[PDB]
Paper text:
The phosphorolytic exoribonuclease polynucleotide phosphorylase (PNPase; EC 2.7.7.8) is encoded in the genomes of bacteria and eukaryotes, and in those domains of life the ribonuclease plays multifaceted roles in regulation and environmental response. While the C-terminal RNase PH-like domain catalyses phosphorolytic attack of RNA, the N-terminal domain has lost this capacity; instead, it contributes to the ring-like quaternary structure of the trimeric PNPase assembly. Two recurrent structural motifs that are found in many RNA-binding proteins, the S1 and K-homology (KH) domains, are appended at the C-terminus of PNPase. The PNPase studied here is from the bacterium Caulobacter crescentus, which has been established as a model system to investigate cell cycle progression, because populations can be readily prepared that are synchronized in the cell cycle.
Caulobacter crescentus PNPase was co-crystallized with a short peptide corresponding to its recognition motif from RNase E in two different space groups (P63 and R3). The asymmetric unit of the rhombohedral crystals contains three PNPase protomers, while the hexagonal crystal form contains a single protomer. Although no electron density was apparent for the KH and S1 domains of PNPase in the rhombohedral crystal form, clear density was present for these domains in the hexagonal crystal. The KH and S1 domains were manually built into this density using as guides the NMR model of the isolated PNPase S1 domain and the X-ray structure of a KH domain from human vigillin. The three KH domains are positioned over the entrance to the catalytic core like an umbrella, with the RNA-binding GSGG loops (residues 572–575) forming a secondary entrance aperture. The S1 domains adopt a splayed conformation, and the conformation is constrained by the crystal packing. Crystals of RNA-free PNPase with recognition peptide (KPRRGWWR) revealed clear density for the peptide in both the hexagonal and rhombohedral crystal forms of PNPase.
Numbering used by the authors:
A (entry chain A): 552 to 632
B (entry chain A): -1 to 696
C (entry chain A): -1 to 148
D (entry chain C): 890 to 897
The structure:
Amino acid sequence: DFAPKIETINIPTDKIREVIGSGGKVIREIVATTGAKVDINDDGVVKVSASDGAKIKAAIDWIKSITDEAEIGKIYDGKVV
Amino acid sequence: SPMFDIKRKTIEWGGKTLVLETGRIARQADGAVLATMGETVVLATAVFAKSQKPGQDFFPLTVNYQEKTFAAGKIPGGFFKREGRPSEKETLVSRLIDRPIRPLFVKGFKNEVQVVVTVLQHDLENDPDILGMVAASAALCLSGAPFMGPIGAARVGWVDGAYVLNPTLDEMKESKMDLVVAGTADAVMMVESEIQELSEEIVLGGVNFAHQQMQAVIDAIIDLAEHAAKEPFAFEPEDTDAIKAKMKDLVGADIAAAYKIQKKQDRYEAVGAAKKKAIAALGLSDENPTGYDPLKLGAIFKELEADVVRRGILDTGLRIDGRDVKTVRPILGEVGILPRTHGSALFTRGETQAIVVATLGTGDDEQFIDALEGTYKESFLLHYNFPPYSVGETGRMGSPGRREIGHGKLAWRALRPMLPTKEDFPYTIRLVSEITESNGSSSMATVCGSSLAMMDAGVPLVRPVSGIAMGLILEQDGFAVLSDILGDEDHLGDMDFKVAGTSEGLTSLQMDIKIAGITPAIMEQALAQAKEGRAHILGEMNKAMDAPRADVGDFAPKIETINIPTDKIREVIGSGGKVIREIVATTGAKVDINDDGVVKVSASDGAKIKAAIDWIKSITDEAEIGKIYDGKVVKVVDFGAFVNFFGAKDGLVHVSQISNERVAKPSDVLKEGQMVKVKLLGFDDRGKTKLSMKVVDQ
Amino acid sequence: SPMFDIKRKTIEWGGKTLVLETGRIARQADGAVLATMGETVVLATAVFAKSQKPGQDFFPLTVNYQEKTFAAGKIPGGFFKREGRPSEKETLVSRLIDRPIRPLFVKGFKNEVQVVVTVLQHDLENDPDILGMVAASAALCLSGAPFMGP
Amino acid sequence: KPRRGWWR
């Protein structure tokens, strides 16, 4: 547990701006809040890190909300509302 | 099995268990213990040469204390992410380990010996230095090398009023003392400390605490050694006496009426005499075997000068310079020599002068000390520099050495106590000390000069600090304690030591003993005299400062500081620095930052700093609290009074809660603009602001 | 008194006054002048060996011109915030000071000699190099070493 | 039988 993860995921490349934001606007906000280190690449690869699994999940789940929507479709699971 | 250990695990040591593994790792060395203190882990290896070098005039000993970053699961911040040139701490422990040892090798023994200690695991609690000293020790005894008696070491702290053994990192945070000590079964050998203004008794009481408290470890090492050390290495502890006595009676009177020579002339003249004369009469010969070769015949004379000078000083406190064991040398302080430099001083003492100059800076000028404990930022930067011309020689230059560092540390250890808090004084103060003359303790002369150079710079040094170099000739019968020793006087005393502090206790004590017998009685008498000396040197310092300059020189800068409630951080920083950059760009002042809600604001102008501060407060203000406050009525009304805690955000003093007893119509203190004091009852319905006058009070 | 200076203060020099203090600092060297040009301040020390080395085929001379950052109230931008390996300028003045001198030691003289100059105050106007050369010079003549003519 | 020793 000392030391740390370090969890990683991919995002469609054409989403870069939206997560970085103008001059880092969104990224810094995301990093400050979740308490996790984020970056960055360009093949759409995101590595997220800190000591807690809690902070990493927080971050990942956040990013996915900005990143999600696809459809595609692409079968999927869900529940009747 | 490979590996045939072997390990004294026993020893819980003042709260913590200590292990000593040998037999498993680095068997190829002569001794290699692996010590453990809770979770902190260091491997010590001693290897020593079995020949002696041909032209070998000194004992070559070398210690390398080294910290691998992985011991605290990191990867170096180096551009190369490997660790290289030794740190301050690496270099400073290495010295601290080396010090007590060197003396303890059998007289005569001149073989190459190299102890390496390497820190493999740091549990962020147990500091590895103390462990490492122990380990070195262990590893050595095990080697069989001629290294007289295992040596222990203990760090002591000061909590409540209890000497506490080996205060872990945390326990240190709340101590008024960092007194490290190493010694044998018989006396302490060395002492390096850092003291938060404590008295001789409390401090030396420290020493003796440590002496006992290591006694467990010394015994332990032996236990291990007993069934684990290598066959001890046979070396004839060289006997000089035979030939030493023979040269004595050829010259032993020729020096009594030689040193007695007041006139520096023959005073050396007799020297060269003896030299020529004796070098001849006995000297491997030509013809004529007996006596010893003209090589080792130097040493004897060298030695013999000692035995002569030393007798001469116990009978009559009359030294070489012809002064009494108690008499300190002429001092002359001098401040603001070369103004322009934030604080300058030319302290000088007989023939030991330093130029010392202070330099204020910002947080940008702090130094990241990427340590294993935890990478951190030091804002107190003593840099010591000892150039060859300072003793009339040539050489070297740049790339400061092990002592150049140990000394500048010794001095820094003797000032950090008397420093204003980043609260009173939010600066980073450098301080290089350039020794321009040495002959006495430049290391002491530096601190004194700093204490000065710093007041000149404008520093709330809570008090000023002095230091004295000290000596100690010791025979079975009598003995002298030398105040303010020369360069020579050291190279002959059986103990030497630097005492530093203020006139309300000690700030640093460093000692280095060479022989057993320094009873705690002899010690106290020693600091006694030191107390006299140092509080005298202090006398002369005040004759050039006595208290800080009111302010600093306009070059360089303030540097003004304030606190804000912590939960306001975001609002001043803004998203990704949005607000902070805007504030810094506009006011022209440097701002940051912390997290305890501490803001330091800086530039050259008081105007820009006030601008910034006043700005931040507007974003920061609003509280209430309430918490009485001052202000002025804005308007009054047969209804009450509206007033100002400042920031428009007025409040109302209800026509009711004005003056008590009776007010008819609120023309009591009705003066549009008249300042009064008021407490906020609380922003009553709605987001309103009730508030009245018990001025005063509750 | 300690210190028995001694100092040619006279000399205003093409607009600027030049001081040369000796007797007060680094008496332990053979010569140690402390020159001043307005506010720029440098200490020069010359120490030279009284023996000559045994196998001594050349004249060993070494000059170290060095600038402490505090002379202009700073703290080095070095990760160690102490100043170390010599700069271009440090190295370049050192050469510039060394050049004119070397020739001027009495033919044959092969003793170890080491002039150190150190800049203590820079007034951002007077460049210390020129001063420093002068200082070296002064400090040397003072040393008694066989160094022909200031 | 004990080893010894320079310590001793």
